[PDB]
């Protein structure tokens, strides 16, 4: 796998993103039964920060959509609730990933996806650190995070969810993956 990505285009991408959010494997996005309008609002809200580095992107391989990722402002997320234990640093960028609902993959799909996302965050969007907050029960994501050098900081409560805060600094990404050449 060698991926490229572009910024999301609501008019063009809405049908696909809505379809992916409806697949049961995407359930941690909590959009299984959503309408097209709901997904349009999700995308437009993700694109509404004043800073253009944030927003959703679509990854491609051989002309076909492969995944969506969001680079988001931690200061407008659950991370920034008082008392979570998150300590904001200038240059922090939050990340979410949504893979397409296709079930036919070559070896190492999600590792190549994550390396692409992380390289984009650091080298295109200027991140100094990537922050994630998956549900503690989402074990698949935890292993994907470990594979690119994330370190767990701890867990924190949100209404109805326990999140696991993990960080990947630009320096740790350099040391652990050779700046995105291999998995940690």
Short mmCIF file of C-alpha atoms in Angstrom, two decimals:
data_model
loop_
_atom_site.label_atom_id
_atom_site.label_comp_id
_atom_site.label_asym_id
_atom_site.label_seq_id
_atom_site.Cartn_x
_atom_site.Cartn_y
_atom_site.Cartn_z
CA UNK A 1 0.00 0.00 0.00
CA UNK A 2 1.09 3.52 -0.91
CA UNK A 3 -1.57 6.07 -0.03
CA UNK A 4 -2.32 9.65 -0.96
CA UNK A 5 -4.93 11.85 0.68
CA UNK A 6 -6.91 15.01 -0.02
CA UNK A 7 -9.25 17.22 1.91
CA UNK A 8 -12.81 15.99 2.19
CA UNK A 9 -15.40 17.30 -0.29
CA UNK A 10 -18.88 17.08 1.24
CA UNK A 11 -20.78 16.98 -2.04
CA UNK A 12 -18.57 14.22 -3.48
CA UNK A 13 -17.75 12.18 -0.38
CA UNK A 14 -20.95 12.26 1.69
CA UNK A 15 -22.49 9.09 0.27
CA UNK A 16 -19.33 7.08 0.90
CA UNK A 17 -18.66 8.42 4.39
CA UNK A 18 -22.27 7.81 5.40
CA UNK A 19 -22.01 4.23 4.09
CA UNK A 20 -18.82 3.59 6.06
CA UNK A 21 -20.31 4.99 9.25
CA UNK A 22 -23.21 2.55 8.90
CA UNK A 23 -21.06 -0.55 8.90
CA UNK A 24 -21.01 -2.28 12.30
CA UNK A 25 -17.19 -2.28 12.42
CA UNK A 26 -17.38 1.55 12.56
CA UNK A 27 -19.54 1.53 15.69
CA UNK A 28 -17.13 3.48 17.87
CA UNK A 29 -17.97 6.49 15.69
CA UNK A 30 -21.53 6.28 17.09
CA UNK A 31 -23.12 7.06 13.71
CA UNK A 32 -24.57 3.65 12.76
CA UNK A 33 -28.14 4.91 12.26
CA UNK A 34 -27.41 8.45 11.14
CA UNK A 35 -28.93 10.35 8.25
CA UNK A 36 -27.06 11.93 5.37
CA UNK A 37 -27.78 15.33 6.94
CA UNK A 38 -26.27 14.15 10.23
CA UNK A 39 -23.09 13.09 8.47
CA UNK A 40 -22.96 16.35 6.51
CA UNK A 41 -23.12 18.19 9.84
CA UNK A 42 -20.33 15.98 11.23
CA UNK A 43 -18.09 16.79 8.29
CA UNK A 44 -18.88 20.51 8.25
CA UNK A 45 -18.32 20.80 12.02
CA UNK A 46 -14.96 19.06 11.64
CA UNK A 47 -14.03 21.65 9.04
CA UNK A 48 -15.10 24.74 10.99
CA UNK A 49 -12.03 25.52 13.08
CA UNK A 50 -10.37 28.85 12.24
CA UNK A 51 -7.08 27.09 11.54
CA UNK A 52 -6.98 25.39 8.12
CA UNK A 53 -4.73 22.54 9.26
CA UNK A 54 -7.74 20.89 10.90
CA UNK A 55 -10.51 18.95 9.16
CA UNK A 56 -11.28 15.65 7.56
CA UNK A 57 -9.23 14.00 4.78
CA UNK A 58 -9.88 11.04 2.47
CA UNK A 59 -7.16 8.51 1.65
CA UNK A 60 -6.82 6.91 -1.80
CA UNK A 61 -5.10 3.90 -3.31
CA UNK A 62 -5.38 2.91 -7.01
CA UNK A 63 -8.07 5.52 -7.48
CA UNK A 64 -10.38 4.19 -4.76
CA UNK A 65 -11.30 5.62 -1.37
CA UNK A 66 -9.67 3.69 1.46
CA UNK A 67 -10.21 5.61 4.70
CA UNK A 68 -11.13 8.91 6.29
CA UNK A 69 -9.15 10.68 8.98
CA UNK A 70 -9.81 13.78 11.02
CA UNK A 71 -7.07 16.07 12.34
CA UNK A 72 -8.83 18.07 15.03
CA UNK A 73 -8.20 20.85 17.49
CA UNK A 74 -7.85 19.31 20.95
CA UNK A 75 -9.10 22.54 22.54
CA UNK A 76 -12.58 21.98 21.05
CA UNK A 77 -12.80 18.28 21.94
CA UNK A 78 -13.50 16.15 25.01
CA UNK A 79 -9.78 16.43 25.78
CA UNK A 80 -10.30 20.03 26.85
CA UNK A 81 -13.02 19.32 29.41
CA UNK A 82 -11.80 20.63 32.79
CA UNK A 83 -10.08 17.94 34.79
CA UNK A 84 -9.31 15.30 32.16
CA UNK A 85 -5.57 15.47 32.81
CA UNK A 86 -4.82 16.45 29.22
CA UNK A 87 -2.03 19.07 29.20
CA UNK A 88 -2.24 21.05 25.96
CA UNK A 89 1.02 21.87 24.19
CA UNK A 90 1.26 24.23 21.23
CA UNK A 91 1.28 22.11 18.10
CA UNK A 92 -0.95 19.35 19.45
CA UNK A 93 -3.33 17.78 16.92
CA UNK A 94 -6.02 15.21 17.68
CA UNK A 95 -6.66 12.33 15.34
CA UNK A 96 -9.60 10.06 14.48
CA UNK A 97 -9.58 7.29 11.86
CA UNK A 98 -12.46 5.67 9.90
CA UNK A 99 -11.61 2.85 7.50
CA UNK A 100 -13.80 2.10 4.52
CA UNK A 101 -16.38 -0.66 4.74
CA UNK A 102 -14.53 -2.77 2.16
CA UNK A 103 -13.33 -6.04 3.67
CA UNK A 104 -10.76 -6.93 0.97
CA UNK A 105 -7.25 -5.83 1.98
CA UNK A 106 -3.61 -6.63 1.23
CA UNK A 107 -1.19 -7.33 4.11
CA UNK A 108 -0.48 -4.54 6.57
CA UNK A 109 -3.33 -2.27 5.49
CA UNK A 110 -3.88 -0.49 8.82
CA UNK A 111 -0.16 -0.05 9.46
CA UNK A 112 0.28 1.69 6.13
CA UNK A 113 -2.84 3.76 6.85
CA UNK A 114 -1.53 4.87 10.24
CA UNK A 115 1.93 5.71 8.93
CA UNK A 116 0.34 7.84 6.21
CA UNK A 117 -1.86 9.67 8.72
CA UNK A 118 0.98 10.31 11.12
CA UNK A 119 3.31 11.56 8.39
CA UNK A 120 0.53 13.87 7.22
CA UNK A 121 -0.03 15.19 10.73
CA UNK A 122 3.63 15.92 11.42
CA UNK A 123 4.94 16.88 7.99
CA UNK A 124 1.96 18.48 6.24
CA UNK A 125 -0.13 19.82 9.13
CA UNK A 126 2.75 20.91 11.35
CA UNK A 127 1.94 18.86 14.41
CA UNK A 128 4.46 18.65 17.20
CA UNK A 129 2.45 15.90 18.92
CA UNK A 130 -0.58 13.78 18.00
CA UNK A 131 -3.15 13.09 20.72
CA UNK A 132 -5.81 10.38 20.69
CA UNK A 133 -8.63 9.49 23.08
CA UNK A 134 -10.23 6.20 22.00
CA UNK A 135 -12.65 4.26 24.15
CA UNK A 136 -10.72 2.06 26.58
CA UNK A 137 -12.57 -0.95 25.16
CA UNK A 138 -11.40 -0.30 21.55
CA UNK A 139 -8.48 -2.71 21.70
CA UNK A 140 -7.88 -2.75 17.93
CA UNK A 141 -7.09 0.98 17.92
CA UNK A 142 -4.83 0.65 20.94
CA UNK A 143 -2.61 -1.80 19.08
CA UNK A 144 -2.61 0.38 15.96
CA UNK A 145 -1.53 3.30 18.12
CA UNK A 146 1.27 1.31 19.73
CA UNK A 147 2.45 0.31 16.24
CA UNK A 148 3.38 3.91 15.39
CA UNK A 149 4.83 4.92 18.74
CA UNK A 150 1.95 6.23 20.84
CA UNK A 151 2.44 6.12 24.61
CA UNK A 152 -0.52 5.77 26.95
CA UNK A 153 -0.85 8.63 29.42
CA UNK A 154 -3.89 7.38 31.34
CA UNK A 155 -7.66 7.07 31.27
CA UNK A 156 -10.27 9.75 31.89
CA UNK A 157 -14.07 9.81 32.22
CA UNK A 158 -16.51 11.41 29.81
CA UNK A 159 -20.29 11.05 30.26
CA UNK A 160 -21.02 7.54 29.05
CA UNK A 161 -17.45 6.75 27.99
CA UNK A 162 -14.05 5.97 29.45
CA UNK A 163 -11.28 7.30 27.18
CA UNK A 164 -7.63 6.26 27.04
CA UNK A 165 -5.41 9.29 26.41
CA UNK A 166 -2.32 8.49 24.32
CA UNK A 167 0.35 10.80 22.90
CA UNK A 168 2.80 10.52 19.99
CA UNK A 169 5.42 13.25 19.98
CA UNK A 170 7.21 14.27 16.81
CA UNK A 171 10.45 13.21 18.50
CA UNK A 172 9.12 9.75 19.44
CA UNK A 173 7.76 9.26 15.93
CA UNK A 174 11.21 10.05 14.52
CA UNK A 175 12.96 7.64 16.89
CA UNK A 176 10.45 4.78 16.75
CA UNK A 177 9.44 4.71 13.06
CA UNK A 178 12.34 6.52 11.34
CA UNK A 179 9.97 9.39 10.57
CA UNK A 180 7.29 7.11 9.23
CA UNK A 181 9.29 4.55 7.26
CA UNK A 182 8.42 1.49 9.35
CA UNK A 183 6.22 0.48 12.26
CA UNK A 184 7.55 1.04 15.76
#
